[PDB]
């Protein structure tokens, strides 16, 4: 009960108006601070026990940030737009050894978001669903997170079918982007962990803390 898309949309609008890898990592650290603010703007998120808020964010940060810059890169030709204002072209990511994953982002996420014209409200609702992941281990009350997730996709579907009545399969189409997001998210972490192991590629304090244990 109570989970209006207006609040979600607002949270989205309020938080966002040489080696490519290094740039992406710096941009990731920068966005992590903004992610915390975004979350606090999501209804009922702050009413959860602190430990649980920490658990949800540490579990979804990577997929949450990917979803954000992917949607922000819809107008981009063959690349993505970083929160720092920098552009990473497909060829550049390829010349850095990250072509495979980069291409997956463009093909499975950026491209599809553009084809269906996913709007900010839809983006926000999907990130809210990711944030409220009831499968996160350690949650003091998983059932509670489950309820929030349900209220979110309930408002999301309502939003759809009303704004896009002509597209009855839209709601399902948005949800079916999550499997790809989960996969891409898992792959980016692996790369990050390898970068941290090799030592190269400067990793800031916030990004580094997310790469902690568990």
């Amino acid at each position: 009960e109570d989970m209006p898309v207006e609040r979600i949309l607002e949270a989205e609008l309020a938080v966002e108006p040489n080696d490519p890898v290094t740039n992406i990592c710096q941009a990731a650290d920068k966005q992590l601070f903004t992610l915390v603010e975004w979350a606090k703007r999501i209804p009922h998120f702050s009413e959860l026990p602190l430990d649980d808020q920490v658990i949800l964010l540490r579990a979804g940060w990577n997929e949450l940030l990917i979803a954000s810059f992917s949607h922000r890169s819809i107008a981009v030709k063959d690349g993505i737009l970083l929160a720092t204002g920098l552009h990473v072209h497909r060829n550049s990511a390829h010349s850095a050894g990250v072509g495979a994953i980069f291409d997956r982002v463009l093909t499975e996420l950026v491209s599809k978001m553009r084809d269906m014209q996913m709007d900010k409200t839809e983006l926000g609702c999907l990130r809210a669903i990711v944030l409220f992941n009831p499968d996160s281990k350690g949650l003091s009350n998983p059932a509670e997170v489950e309820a929030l997730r349900e209220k979110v996709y309930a408002s999301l579907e309502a939003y759809c079918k009303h704004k896009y009545p002509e597209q009855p399969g839209r709601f399902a189409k948005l949800l079916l982007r999550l499997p790809a997001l989960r996969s891409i998210g898992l792959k980016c972490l692996e790369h990050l962990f390898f970068f941290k192991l090799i030592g190269d590629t400067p990793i800031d304090t916030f990004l580094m803390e997310m790469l902690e244990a568990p």
Partner: peptide, 11 residues
Amino acid sequence: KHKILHRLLQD
């Protein structure tokens, strides 16, 4: 554990 994150979520 999770020093930074907690501080930000608290304020």
